[PDB]
Every structure is written in structure tokens, then in C-alpha cells.
Amino acid sequence: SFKATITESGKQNIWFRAIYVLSTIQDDIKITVTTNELIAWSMNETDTTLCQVRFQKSFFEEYEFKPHEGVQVIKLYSFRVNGRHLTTISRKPDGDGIKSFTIAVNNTSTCPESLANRLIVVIEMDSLIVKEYCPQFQPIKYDPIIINLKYKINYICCNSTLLKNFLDNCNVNVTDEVKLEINVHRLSITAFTKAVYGKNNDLLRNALSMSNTISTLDLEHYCLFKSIIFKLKDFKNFITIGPSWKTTQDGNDNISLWFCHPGDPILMQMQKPGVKLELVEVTDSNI
Amino acid sequence: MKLKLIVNGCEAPDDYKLLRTTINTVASLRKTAILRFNSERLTIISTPKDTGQLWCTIPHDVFRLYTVISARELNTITMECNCDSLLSVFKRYDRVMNQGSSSNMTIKLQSPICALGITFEEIVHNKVIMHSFKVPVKLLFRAQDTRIQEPMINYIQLMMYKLPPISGEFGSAFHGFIRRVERYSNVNHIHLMGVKVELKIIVNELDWHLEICWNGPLDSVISTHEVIIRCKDWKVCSKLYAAFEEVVLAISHDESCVFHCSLDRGRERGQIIYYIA
Amino acid sequence: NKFSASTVHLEHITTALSCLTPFGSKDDVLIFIDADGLSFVRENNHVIKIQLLLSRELFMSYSYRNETEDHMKLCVKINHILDSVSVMNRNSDDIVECTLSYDGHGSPFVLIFEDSFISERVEYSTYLIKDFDTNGLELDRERISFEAIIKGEALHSALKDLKEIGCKECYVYAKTEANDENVFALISKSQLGFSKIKLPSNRSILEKLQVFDGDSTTVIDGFAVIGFFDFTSFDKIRKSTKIASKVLFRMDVHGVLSVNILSQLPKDYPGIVIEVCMLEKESIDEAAQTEIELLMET
Amino acid sequence: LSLQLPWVEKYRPQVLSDIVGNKETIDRLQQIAKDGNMPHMIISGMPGIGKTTSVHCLAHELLGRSYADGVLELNASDDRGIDVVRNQIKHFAQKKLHLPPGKHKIVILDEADSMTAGAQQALRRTMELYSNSTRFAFACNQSNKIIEPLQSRCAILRYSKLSDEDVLKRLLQIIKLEDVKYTNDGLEAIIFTAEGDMRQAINNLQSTVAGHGLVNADNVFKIVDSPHPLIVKKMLLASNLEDSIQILRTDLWKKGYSSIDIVTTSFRVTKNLAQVKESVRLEMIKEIGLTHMRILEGVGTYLQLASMLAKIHKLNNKA
Amino acid sequence: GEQWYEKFKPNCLEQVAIHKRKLKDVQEALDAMFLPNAKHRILLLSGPSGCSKSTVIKELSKILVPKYRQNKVTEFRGDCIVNDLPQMESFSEFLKGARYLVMSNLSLILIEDLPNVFHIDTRRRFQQLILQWLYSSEPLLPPLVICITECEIPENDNNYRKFGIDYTFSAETIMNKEILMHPRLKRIKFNPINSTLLKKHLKFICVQNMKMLKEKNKWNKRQEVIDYIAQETGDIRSAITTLQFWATSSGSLPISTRESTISYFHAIGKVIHGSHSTNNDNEMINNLFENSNNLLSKEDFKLGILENYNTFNKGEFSISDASSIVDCLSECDNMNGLPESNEYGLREVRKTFRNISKQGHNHGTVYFPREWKVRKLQNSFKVQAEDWLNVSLYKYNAVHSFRNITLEFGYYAPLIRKCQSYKKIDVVDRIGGPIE
DNA sequence: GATTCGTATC
DNA sequence: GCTACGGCTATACGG
Numbered sequence A: 001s002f003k004a005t006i007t008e009s010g011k012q013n014i015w016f017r018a019i020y021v022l023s024t025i026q027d028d029i030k031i032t033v034t035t036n037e038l039i040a041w042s043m044n045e046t047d048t049t050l051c052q053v054r055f056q057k058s059f060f061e062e063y064e065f066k067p068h069e070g071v072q073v074i075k076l077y078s079f080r081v082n083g084r085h086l087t088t089i090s091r092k093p094d095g096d097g098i099k100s101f102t103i104a105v106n107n108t109s110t111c112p113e114s115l116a117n118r119l120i121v122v123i124e125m126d127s128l129i130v131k132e133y134c135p136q137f138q139p140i141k142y143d144p145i146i147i148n149l150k151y152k153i154n155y156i157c158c159n160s161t162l163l164k165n166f167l168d169n170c171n172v173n174v175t176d177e178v179k180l181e182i183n184v185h186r187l188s189i190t191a192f193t194k195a196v197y198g199k200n201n202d203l204l205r206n207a208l209s210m211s212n213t214i215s216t217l218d219l220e221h222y223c224l225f226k227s228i229i230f231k232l233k234d235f236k237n238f239i240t241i242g243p244s245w246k247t248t249q250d251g252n253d254n255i256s257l258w259f260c261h262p263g264d265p266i267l268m269q270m271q272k273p274g275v276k277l278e279l280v281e282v283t284d285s286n287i
Numbered sequence B: 001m002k003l004k005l006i007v008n009g010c011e012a013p014d015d016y017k018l019l020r021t022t023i024n025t026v027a028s029l030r031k032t033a034i035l036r037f038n039s040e041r042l043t044i045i046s047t048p049k050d051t052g053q054l055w056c057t058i059p060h061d062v063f064r065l066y067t068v069i070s071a072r073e074l075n076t077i078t079m080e081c082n083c084d085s086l087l088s089v090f091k092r093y094d095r096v097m098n099q100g101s102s103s104n105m106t107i108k109l110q111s112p113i114c115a116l117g118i119t120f121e122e123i124v125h126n127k128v129i130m131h132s133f134k135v136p137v138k139l140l141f142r143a144q145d146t147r148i149q150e151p152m153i154n155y156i157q158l159m160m161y162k163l164p165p166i167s168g169e170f171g172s173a174f175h176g177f178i179r180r181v182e183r184y185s186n187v188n189h190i191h192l193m194g195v196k197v198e199l200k201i202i203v204n205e206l207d208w209h210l211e212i213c214w215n216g217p218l219d220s221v222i223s224t225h226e227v228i229i230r231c232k233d234w235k236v237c238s239k240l241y242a243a244f245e246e247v248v249l250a251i252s253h254d255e256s257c258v259f260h261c262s263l264d265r266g267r268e269r270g271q272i273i274y275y276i277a
Numbered sequence C: 001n002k003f004s005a006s007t008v009h010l011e012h013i014t015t016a017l018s019c020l021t022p023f024g025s026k027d028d029v030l031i032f033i034d035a036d037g038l039s040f041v042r043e044n045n046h047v048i049k050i051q052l053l054l055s056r057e058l059f060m061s062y063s064y065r066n067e068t069e070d071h072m073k074l075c076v077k078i079n080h081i082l083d084s085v086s087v088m089n090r091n092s093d094d095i096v097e098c099t100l101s102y103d104g105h106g107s108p109f110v111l112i113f114e115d116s117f118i119s120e121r122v123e124y125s126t127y128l129i130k131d132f133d134t135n136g137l138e139l140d141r142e143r144i145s146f147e148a149i150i151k152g153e154a155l156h157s158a159l160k161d162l163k164e165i166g167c168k169e170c171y172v173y174a175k176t177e178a179n180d181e182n183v184f185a186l187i188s189k190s191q192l193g194f195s196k197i198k199l200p201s202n203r204s205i206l207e208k209l210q211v212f213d214g215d216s217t218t219v220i221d222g223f224a225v226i227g228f229f230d231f232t233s234f235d236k237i238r239k240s241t242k243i244a245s246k247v248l249f250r251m252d253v254h255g256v257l258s259v260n261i262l263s264q265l266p267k268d269y270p271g272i273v274i275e276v277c278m279l280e281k282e283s284i285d286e287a288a289q290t291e292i293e294l295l296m297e298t
Numbered sequence D: 001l002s003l004q005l006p007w008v009e010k011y012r013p014q015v016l017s018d019i020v021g022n023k024e025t026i027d028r029l030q031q032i033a034k035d036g037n038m039p040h041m042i043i044s045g046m047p048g049i050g051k052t053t054s055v056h057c058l059a060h061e062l063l064g065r066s067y068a069d070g071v072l073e074l075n076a077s078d079d080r081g082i083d084v085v086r087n088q089i090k091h092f093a094q095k096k097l098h099l100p101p102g103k104h105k106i107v108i109l110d111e112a113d114s115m116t117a118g119a120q121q122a123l124r125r126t127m128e129l130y131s132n133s134t135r136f137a138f139a140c141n142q143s144n145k146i147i148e149p150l151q152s153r154c155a156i157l158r159y160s161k162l163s164d165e166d167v168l169k170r171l172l173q174i175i176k177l178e179d180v181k182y183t184n185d186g187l188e189a190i191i192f193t194a195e196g197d198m199r200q201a202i203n204n205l206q207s208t209v210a211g212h213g214l215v216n217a218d219n220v221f222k223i224v225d226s227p228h229p230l231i232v233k234k235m236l237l238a239s240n241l242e243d244s245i246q247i248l249r250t251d252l253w254k255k256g257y258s259s260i261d262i263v264t265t266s267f268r269v270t271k272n273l274a275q276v277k278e279s280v281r282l283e284m285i286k287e288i289g290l291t292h293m294r295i296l297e298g299v300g301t302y303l304q305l306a307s308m309l310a311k312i313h314k315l316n317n318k319a
Numbered sequence E: 001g002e003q004w005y006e007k008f009k010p011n012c013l014e015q016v017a018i019h020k021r022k023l024k025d026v027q028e029a030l031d032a033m034f035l036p037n038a039k040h041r042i043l044l045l046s047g048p049s050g051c052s053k054s055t056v057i058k059e060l061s062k063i064l065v066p067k068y069r070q071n072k073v074t075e076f077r078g079d080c081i082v083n084d085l086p087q088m089e090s091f092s093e094f095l096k097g098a099r100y101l102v103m104s105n106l107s108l109i110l111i112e113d114l115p116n117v118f119h120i121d122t123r124r125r126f127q128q129l130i131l132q133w134l135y136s137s138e139p140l141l142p143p144l145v146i147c148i149t150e151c152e153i154p155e156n157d158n159n160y161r162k163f164g165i166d167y168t169f170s171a172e173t174i175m176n177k178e179i180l181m182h183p184r185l186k187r188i189k190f191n192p193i194n195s196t197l198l199k200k201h202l203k204f205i206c207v208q209n210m211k212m213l214k215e216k217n218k219w220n221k222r223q224e225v226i227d228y229i230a231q232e233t234g235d236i237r238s239a240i241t242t243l244q245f246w247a248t249s250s251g252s253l254p255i256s257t258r259e260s261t262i263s264y265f266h267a268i269g270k271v272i273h274g275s276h277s278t279n280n281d282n283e284m285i286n287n288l289f290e291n292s293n294n295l296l297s298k299e300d301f302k303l304g305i306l307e308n309y310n311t312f313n314k315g316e317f318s319i320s321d322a323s324s325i326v327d328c329l330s331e332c333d334n335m336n337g338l339p340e341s342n343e344y345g346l347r348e349v350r351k352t353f354r355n356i357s358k359q360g361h362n363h364g365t366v367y368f369p370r371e372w373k374v375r376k377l378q379n380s381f382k383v384q385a386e387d388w389l390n391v392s393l394y395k396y397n398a399v400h401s402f403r404n405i406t407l408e409f410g411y412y413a414p415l416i417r418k419c420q421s422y423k424k425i426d427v428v429d430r431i432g433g434p435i436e
Numbered sequence F: 001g002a003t004t005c006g007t008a009t010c
Numbered sequence G: 001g002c003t004a005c006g007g008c009t010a011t012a013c014g015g
């Protein structure tokens, strides 16, 4: 019914760091198979952050889809698989190279019950070792986000190198608030933390703020068609997915942002030649 | 109570590295340390009051500036300072001079709980970056100061041994001798021995018995001498010997052990004494 | 003393001893001392046994003055030798010289290390020998169901993958086909589900796979050999496969598996012969083997 | 040696029609097995009355050929911690195995009384979310050892002690399938020594036929003894002291029973003793406990037991 | 093909089996915390299992959230193992992500499945995070509702160092005194469902399953089943489960329901005044010991008996009976916690109060033992005596023992320091206060 | 299980 | 080609 293969090192790297992030956003990763692309997405338990990756058909050397042979007609097949179980399959072993990563599912009447409701992943190493896994999956119903056309509304385009360095400098253990303060002149991003006070001013939680101001010269494209606050861990992980695939032909290494008000969610979207990446994150409505 | 000092690591490397030798030891031993700023000399103290005590003497000529005035006797004011913060500041200056610089440390006593204004400069490559730090300290009272005195060590007919310098041929061999017992995980007591010159590291237990020996030459300037010591104190002794050329070892029969370290600055000589019960 | 052995290749002895650490590192190790060499036999729960082999040519000196007895058995705690021989033999100008000796019963096992200017000495008091027979955890020489030779690197990667995917239980396949096709996979039951690591049929990885009829002489094609082994015991060979070039696998009809680690310093000595005998689980389930077979079909 | 299984395992019922006793519960279990809709159930009772062989047979009949991949048996011999509940039970519940309509996956959590508290509190959510596909069958010896929120979602099935006729029927079935010579008094003695425990009846019958062959009262009572609670009851309910001391000595001290065992059984017998005034019962409890303390402190002698019996008779005659 | 407690769940608020006053109080509280600046920030709901503690919130949300939401509930899921998330920070991340649920995404956060509060290290983190929520400086936060089921933790560990969480799973053993007494925490404790709403909501299910109950001729013995179920249990889920298990049956299987745990004061009242059902005290004591051993086999119970035996006749009984109660309670203290000690100290008291049991007696109100206050006063005395010894050995030179302090230098020395020093920094008053 | 207060209902 | 250091992981400890 579906068969996809990966035969590139960078493609396997981005696939692993794409899935590793969706596994650390939600315990189970929901994957929808389309006729033109493969979509893997993950939603928070609080329904506050969503990351959706879309590996085009050209991203896979072999891409076959036979939905005629659960299924939602909009013919799209969606299934839910454990994120931790999937991220331990796509990991690159040390000392060996994955010459082929095949992801497939054949849900027919002839297929045995040992493979029924069991996702089929076949890995061929450079040492010719064939490692086949059969993780179970649960067919679910895909629900698409209109945010992509809802507010595809000032737009921010900045290179992800310096921002990635700044976010890696920050830690999610003590800081989880990101203030993206942007004006027409400059752009400043500070990772701060509010300090709550106990009974008698006692420091229940301390306040740490690491600020990094970015000049508009480093900024690529901005148009005020602005203070926004959101989380840090989701933004950090979504930032570390595009760099994973070392691509020099596209030369993107940049992120696209959209937000309207402190109430509406902010959309962050990264671009790759065969991979479409987006991050949905709710914003603090405190005006 | 006005205290102000200026240190330059690049100007004098020996007195500066002995300051690094004193700070690392008081950091490794236990948290917090005692700093008595006598008008002519400094002494950095870590008193746990069985656990060992270190008494390192730091002269007044080591720093470029040693202005010290107080209402107590001989201009003595005594600090209690958390060693982690000053160790971090000192490591920051080590990295400052490693990257290439020659700036000095301006340390001032800015206000019983006080703090030291340890400020210095760093230049990256012709940029001015000022590093300001404030380590919270407490003021020890004079009555509390006189409660702390250096442990006394006698040798009516005991035995001090001259440990060969680490710069010599046998220095590395003796360092390996001292660190050989440190490789074992399940060791807590070491039994030192004294014969007059051989010294042996003996660890006897229920089912196993170490008996390491030193077959090289030894010197004793001018009878059995055995003591039971802890392994952590032996690690501190290893670290102290690694940074000292002149090391003096004296062993008492079932009473105590003393690890004496001295640097010949000649000028008053800086000495480090590790009293071990 | 009654026995004395010295060497300088402390790295080899350290690697041999580190292969006994997977079996606990907080218990007793039993040592054989005969004219051929000295060995470390270690057993856990009477279900797995590992045996080293340090030849006499490995050490520069091997005297063995014990004319009265053919071999000497001593029992000491394993952790202490592991901590002692880890000198790493630094400062190559002055090589740390080993010295192993054992004067006999009542005498302690001595490990004298010489650093030219330093002569340390460690004495290990031996313990009473437990009433257990090492011959029990041994494989037949006439009932071999299958015999396979696998290179060390591929096997080590397979065990590393099995450990990473959890692998609470493991299975072994060995089927020979009449068209010279040989299949060998380590099927495992883990949190993921049903996972298979098929070894390649090329001679660079599967040098020789021969499936017998329980007589170690007949070559039957189209038959399958199934071994259900607990991965707790199967993981003990992972560290032994990290130093091996070729691994010999042999199992019989009585459910014992012999992992023969072949490790490839003096020129005369062959190497460390590490033998890890392992017992098969009873497998009260009967449909599990049918599911294994069906998974191997497709 | 031989591969001949012990009759406890050789004659374990494989169908619900072979499980004797609790007819009103076995019939309901068969009705569930035929209809298909199996509610969450907690089966509790005394040891050896058929609580495990009932759940296993019910699961077997309910799932047919899908038993290998439709059940998840987690016993106390497995690490039934909170991590296992959060991972293995969750993944088994999330499995989407297709079953005949009305059938459900069964999680046979045998010996659920030994499960920890956090594991049960996670099991709460496990049966709350995944209840349309999998069903939980708790088997225990004490229902109060399962937390109240877990007992709320289950249906309590209380197995009772087996009577003297159901055990006799099963024993006769075994004796018919093993060609065992017997006599009626020997079988009655086996039932009497079983105390409503089928396992301890099969074991005693096997021991008797192995040691002597013919199942009579002598061959039974010369290998398996009369229940010591019933001898302690006879000792504690005597009239004179010289008639209770005889039953103490010649039936509990020269037979090989420890003094602490005698006192522990005496406390249980006193708790369940009937036709005895409550003041007498509480005084007997106090006197048994005072001797229990002395025995636990070291003086476990026959003189102390004699003194305890004498004080019991003292409280009996006037106090 | 479904359980009857899931196919007959309330769709509206009028089908929820809850008392009208309780529903009104919860309505007022919840409507109070949905206001912009709410005095209460967390709503705690305590009570036994199946008291509609989550069946009322999940139907109040459907009528309250889509009224203040600018243009249901967000349950915390314990079994969510995120990669790169230690198992102690899951609730912290849930709280951090749940603070953004404000207008234009407003949702009431419900915490029914609490984190693993049976571990000493994450219970502290739970309490600290709840305190941070209660002391949050954020001017705008979503309402928070925590439902804790009061159930007795069964005896599984083998140690006398068992804490509160190893005896009872209640709002006191999970939340500290500061959170419970916090001004911004409204606690609405629940009660078991009474025999009237349980008798009505089960007859509802019966008249919906009219067809199945009529086919099996189970319509003439119906009320004899609903009344028995309502009289036995106060559970809305177990009652429906038993009703389904009885209606789906085709025989004479005796129906059963989950057992209730007798509380502390309930067991004290059972021991002192006796049970209304069983007239045999031996059976009552045996069932109390076999159903509530985790409470009877303690020291607080034997202390409560001594503190509450005077409330039988408000103190109007013979002193010869009081002596026969206290001497047995004292003899039980020397038995070193043997199982034969509690069974004697609970039987003698019951026999004594039964032999004097006559009608017309106006009993008193029981109370908790006061030893916990005595121990705290003793600790205060210990601290004061330590300060006395410290100040008597640095401002002077004299070593004195603690016993001598409590006997002579805890009263005479304060008077001397009140006259020698004050009359003509230090200790001047009696140690631990006067003897009143 | 006890008392006291407060309803709802027959 | 070799070494330092960061990431991964097994193991002892703590309440």
C-alpha cells in the first residue's frame, strides 16, 4: 500500500532529527501518507504547540502509494506510532552506515497477521546487514491546521545560524520563556524567566534573562504588514532540524515567522529542498 | 577595616601559581575558607572544626599592593568566604591571561557581612571588557579569630624525610609512587611506614593487602614510624606535591602526619602545611 | 614460589579481565593454573559460563614448579584484579612489569607490578572452592545442531543494536538452503515488537554455516535451528565480541550454546581463547516458534 | 527420572466445565465466554479453590486462536512496577488486534494484591482510557489490597471454599483416570485433611498412592496428619486441665509443632471460637498474647504453654 | 457491547448523581474562578471514588468555558514519556504549557490523574509547582481544578517508617499545610452518593434496558435489586457495574459490590458505641480487623480510644468501668504491638460499654488525640532548654544536665534571672512557659 | 458511628 | 594520525 526509501546520508540525518523532535514533543508520532508527500506531525498534550514535517515524494528515491489496495477521503492514510520506538530505529549506528532506510506498510487481505497493524521498516547497512523492525501502529484521523493560510501580519525572515547558537546557549531547565521583541529598526530576542514570590517575598522561583540583540543588517527580510512571548524548548528543537541536513545548493539556513497579536499563535516555518517544516506555537495573551 | 590588594599573575609567576596552589587545595578540601590578612602576611585556612587542616603562609611581597588597616591587633581582619565563587573568578582570570593579556586584579573590601570587589580587565583581538565580581563574605570576630590556631607538630626523636623535587630524575617516579595507591577504588586507609631510608604504602584489609615500595634514593636531613591515614588526604598530598618542588614529609608514630610544602622565593618564603591527624 | 609468571603486555591481560566484568564485577573468579597457562572461569546462576585462556607463551616467564599437581584451583574476588591491572602501562620508556605468583594453598595470589623505581605488591587471599562442576556448562562434540562462524564486528554491531532496542528476549535462526544460501538472524522480542537482524550470506561475514541433524556429521538443507535465549545471558558476549576477529557459534539438541571468541605481543602465543557457554530457555510456548518461522518466511 | 507431571499440573482443568465448585460463578463465567462481553472482574477467595484456572480457561475460550497475541499475563514473578504499567500494559492496550465481535483483549493481572500503589494508580488511567478494546481480570486472595478506585470499575466475583462433594467429584474423576485403588473412609479422610483445598487434596492423594497404594484411613493418616487448627481447638475447648494438657503434649509437642506455631494458631482459633462469652474470649486473647510475648523473647518451652492453658482454664471456670 | 457506566453517562448537568447543594456550591465556586481577577486560583475536590468529582466538572465545563472564552477541559496525562524529559519534569512542562490557556484559547485545566506522588522526590516537586501556581505573579491565569480521590493505601511495604502517603491517599498526604490553608485554594469536599439519587439513576438505567430486563423476566424483582444496591454502596460507577452484571446474568448469582473503608472516627465510634447492623461484637471486631487492619494496628487508634471513651455518656458512667478500660489499655502498651494486643484492647472497651449500654443516653462528640500538641510543646521546651544551656556556658562556666534543667533550673533559674538581673540577651521566663 | 442543624417530602 | 572533550550509558545511592 505504501513503500518509501531513503538512500542519502543527509536525508537520513534530517529524517532522524525530524522524528527525534516529534518524539520529544509528544509520546506518539502520527504519520499521514499522501499520494504526493509524506507528512509527520506531533501535537502537544495541552494543544499549545504543533510541529509538522512534510517529506516530499522527491525526498525519497522510491515512493509508491496504493491506497486502493484509517483511510480518510479529502485518499489519505494516517497512522499513529510511538515516537520513542521510531526514533530508536532511524538512529544512525556508530561505525556503520545506513545504505538504505525503507519505510513501508502493506495493509491487504493476503498479508499475515504478524504484519497486520505492524509498520514495516527495513534497514540495510554498509556492512550488508539487514535489520528489519515491526513496530505496531494505530490508524487515526488526520486533522489539518489552517494556520498555514490563516496567517501564512508582520513577517520576519532571519538566518538560523546565530539564532541557533543563541538558543543552544540558553537552557530549557531554568528558562522556558522567549520574548521576540521586534521593531522596524532592530530585532532583540531575550530568553527570560518570571520570578514568583512566596509568602514573605521568599524566592520560590528565581529570574534569569539572557538577551541577544540582532541588528537589521543580519536580518534578511522584515515587513510590518511588536512583542511576542512563547516557549523555548519547542522553538529550540524546531531550530535544530534544518541544520541536520547539510545542504549547500539551497543555501537557506533561515527561518520564516508570522504573528499578529499576543493572542494569536505564532507560525515558524523552515524550508528544505525535499522537506517542508513548520512549527505552531501559542503566544502569551497578556497585552 | 579598609582592605585593598593588587595581584599581577604575569609579573610574578611563582607567587601567583602558589596562590593557584592554595585556592585549588582549599576548594578540594571543603566548602568555605578562612582568610586572615595580617599586616605583613596572609594565611589561608580550612578548619573543619580527624579531618585534616591546611595552613598556607602567603607573604605581603607577593602582591603589587598590600594596604591593610584595621582596629584589631597588627591590622588583622579575618574573612569567611565561599571558595566556589572566588575559584570561578580566579579561573576566569586564568582564561583571561591565557587568551593573551597582562592586566592586574584590583581587589577591594567594599561593604557583619561584606564582599570583595574583585575587578579586572580583559582585551580580545583592542577591546575593553570589564569583569566585575562580588563574593559575599562574613567578618570573623577577634574572639572568634583567636579560637583558630595552627596545629603544633614535634619530633622529639621522630622522622622527617626530604621528598625529592619533582623537577629531578626521581620526581616523576616518586609522583607515580604516591599516585599508585590512588588507582584502587576500594581503598579508605593507607598505613605509612618509616625506616632509617625507605617509605612504603601498606593497605591491609580482611582479604587483600597492598604493600607498595619506593626503591629509589631518598634523603632525610638531621626506629619505626607508622600512621593510618585516609585516601582523600593522600589525594590532597598528591596535588600539593605536584605543584611544589620543595616538599617535606614527616611521620609520627601513631600520632599524626604532616605534609610540609615550601617555595623558596629568595625574601620571605611561602609555605604550605597540611596537618593530618 | 610454586608458580610464577611475569609479562609487560598489561593491555592484553587488562582486555582479557574486562571480558569477565560483564558477569557482575562483584563476586568470585576461579583460576586454573597448569602448564599450558592460566585461565579465569566465571559462572553466573549456573546458566552461563565464561572461560579465558592466557597461554604460557603470552607471558615472558612461566615456570609452574608444581610437579605434584596437574592444575591449581584458586578462588578470589574479581573486582580487585580488574582494578589492579588497569595501570594502562604509561611512560613507555619504563614499561610497568607484571609479576603473577601463587605459592600454593593458604598462600595469597600475588600481583607484583614493577615501575623500575617502584615495586608495588598486592596479595589476594584465596577463598574456599564452591562445590560446582565447570563441566556441566559444556557443549557436546557429537550432537551439534548447527555450527556458524561470524566475524566479530558484525556480531558486535548486532548485539549493540539489540541492547539499544531493549531486547528482553532473543531468538537465533540457522537455516541452510540447497542453493548454497545460508541465513542467520537474531530475532528479538523487545518493547518495539518483533525485530530481526539478518546477517549477510557473504563469506566476509558468514564464513561457514552448517546445519546438522544432531549428529554433527549430516548436512541437512531446508531445516531450521531455533534457540530461545534470554538476552541477559546473551549480552555477556558483547564485550567479548569487541576484541574478536571471528566468532564460532555452536549449539546442540540439548539447548546449550557455545560462543567461541577467537581473538587475533609475543609471536608464539595464539591469543585469548574466550568460551562463553550459554543455556537455552525452555520455551513452554509452542506458537512462538511458529511465529518465528512465519516471520522468517516473509 | 520421568516426564510425568504432578497431578496438580497434570489434571489442571482446561475447560470451564471441568472446574468444580462455585457453580453459580462458573456458570456466569461460561455465559460470559459464550456471549463475549467480559466486564472488568476481580476474582478473590481462599487459596486453591480455582481462581487462576477459571480466568485462564475463560480467556482461552473467549479468544480462541488469538490467545497468544490477545492476552497479557503479568504475575508477581514479573516486575509489576509503575514503569511496566506505563509502557508494556499501555502498549498492549494500544494494540489494534482485530477480534470477533464482542471479544476483547484480557490483561490477566494475577496476584494483584502484591502490586504497588503507584502501579495501581497508573492502572486507573490505563483502564479509564483503553476500556473499549482491553479488559482487566484481577485475581487476588484479599480484595481490600486493591485500591478502591480500581475496585469501583470492576465487578467483584467472590469465590468461596469448596464443599466436600465438589472436591469428592474431582477426586473421583482423578482416581478414575489414574486407576487408583481406594476406600470410602480414605477418601473421606483426604477431604477432611484438605480443608476445602483441591490442591492440598490432590497432593495428599498422590502422596498416599505413592507411599502405600491403597487409599484407606490408616494409609492416609499415617502420611498426612490431621489439621493442627482442629487439634488446637480441641485443646482450647476442653473441660479439665489434665485433658487439655494431654492434647497439647501428645498431639502438638511430641508430634513436632513449634510453640510459636501453637500460640499463633491458638489466637486464630480463639478469634473464631463460638459458644464462648466475649469476656472469656478477650481474656483468652490476653493470656495467649502474654505467652506469645514470652515465646518471642526466648522462653518457648512446654511449661509456658501449660501455664497458658492453666490460665485459660482459670478464666473459664469462674472469671 | 459496552459497559453501562459509559453508555448511560450524563449528557446534561441534570442527570449527574450529585446533591443539589453540592452542585450549587461547585457551580458558584467554578463561576467565581472564571472571572478576570479571581480570589480562588485552584479548586480542590476531595472525597471517595465515584462521587461525581469528575462527572460534574466535565459537564460544568461544557456550559461555563464557552461563555467566558473570547472568540471542554485539558486533562493531565501521567503516562506520557517524552524523549529528553526526565519523569519529574512532565508536570512542570504541563503547567508551563497550560498557563497560556487564556482568552481566545480558554480552557479549564483538570488534574485527575496526579503524578507519581508515592515517590518522595516528585511529591515535593508537585507541591512546589502547585505553590508556584498559587503564588504566581502572572496577572491572568486559567482556572485550575484538582480532583483527589480519598482511598486507603493497602499495606504492601514492610517497615514501621511508613509515612502519610503509605497509609491514606488523601489531600493532606499529598498537599502540605500551606497549600491546603492557602487563601486562593477553595476545597469542596465530597460525600458518597446517597440512597435516593442512587435509587433514581439506577431505575433510569433499568427503564432504558426495559427490553432486556423484560425478556429475562427481570422486572418483578427490580426494586428489590436497586434498593439493595443503594443501601450497600454509595458509588455511582460500581452500582451501575453491579446492575449490568446482574441484568446480563441468567442465574441466581448473589450480587456484590466494592467494600468501603471504615474511617478513623467511624472505627472509634464503632468500638465505643457499637454497630447498628451486627449485634455480635466478636463478628464486628473480626470484620473491622480484617477490613481495616491498616488503621486498627496503629498507636493513634489506641490513643483515640483513651481520648474518647469519656464521650459515651458525656462522662456519666461508673469510674469502675473507666478503670477497667484504662488498665487494659495500659496492659496493651506492654505487649510490644503484638496482634493479640489490639484485639484485646478493642474487645475489652466494647464489652465494658456494652454492659452499661442503655437507651436514653446522650453521647458526646469524639475528638482526635492531643498527643501531637504535647510533642510540639515538648520540642519547644527542648529548644528553650538547649538555649538555656548554651547561654549558661558561654556567658558563664557551668555544665548542667537536661533532667536537672527540667526539674530545678527550668523554674528557679528564670526567677533568679528575673530578680537578680531584671529587678536590679538572657532567659528570664519559665522554660517552655509556666505550668498554667 | 454519634450529635446538631437544615431541608423536602408525604 | 592522535588526543581532548562532549554525549551516551551503566551503576551505586537516597528518600
Ligand SMILES: Nc1ncnc2c1ncn2[C@@H]1O[C@H](COP(=O)(O)OP(=O)(O)OP(O)(O)=S)[C@@H](O)[C@H]1O
Residues within 6 Å of the ligand: D007, D008, D009, D011, D012, D013, D018, D019, D020, D021, D046, D047, D048, D049, D050, D051, D052, D053, D054, D140, D141, D162, D170, D198, D199, D202
Ligand atoms: N474447582 C476446581 N475444580 C477442579 N480443580 C480445581 C478446582 N479448584 C482448584 N483445583 C485444582 O487446583 C490446582 C490449580 O489451583 P489454582 O486454581 O491455580 O489455585 P487458586 O484457587 O487460583 O489459588 P491461588 O490464588 O493460586 S493460592 C489444580 O490442581 C486444579 O485442578
Ligand SMILES: Nc1ncnc2c1ncn2[C@@H]1O[C@H](COP(=O)(O)OP(=O)(O)OP(O)(O)=S)[C@@H](O)[C@H]1O
Residues within 6 Å of the ligand: D148, D149, D150, D152, E005, E006, E008, E009, E010, E015, E016, E017, E018, E048, E049, E050, E051, E052, E053, E054, E055, E056, E112, E147, E149, E201, E236, E237, E240
Ligand atoms: N448519573 C451519573 N452520575 C455520575 N456518574 C455517572 C452517572 N452515570 C454514569 N456515570 C459514570 O460514573 C463515573 C463516575 O466517575 P467520577 O466520580 O466522575 O470520577 P471520580 O470521582 O474521579 O472517581 P475515581 O476516583 O476516578 S474511581 C463516570 O465514568 C461516569 O461516566
Ligand SMILES: [Mg+2]
Residues within 6 Å of the ligand: D052
Ligand atoms: Mg495460581
Ligand SMILES: [Mg+2]
Residues within 6 Å of the ligand: E054, E055, E112
Ligand atoms: Mg473520574
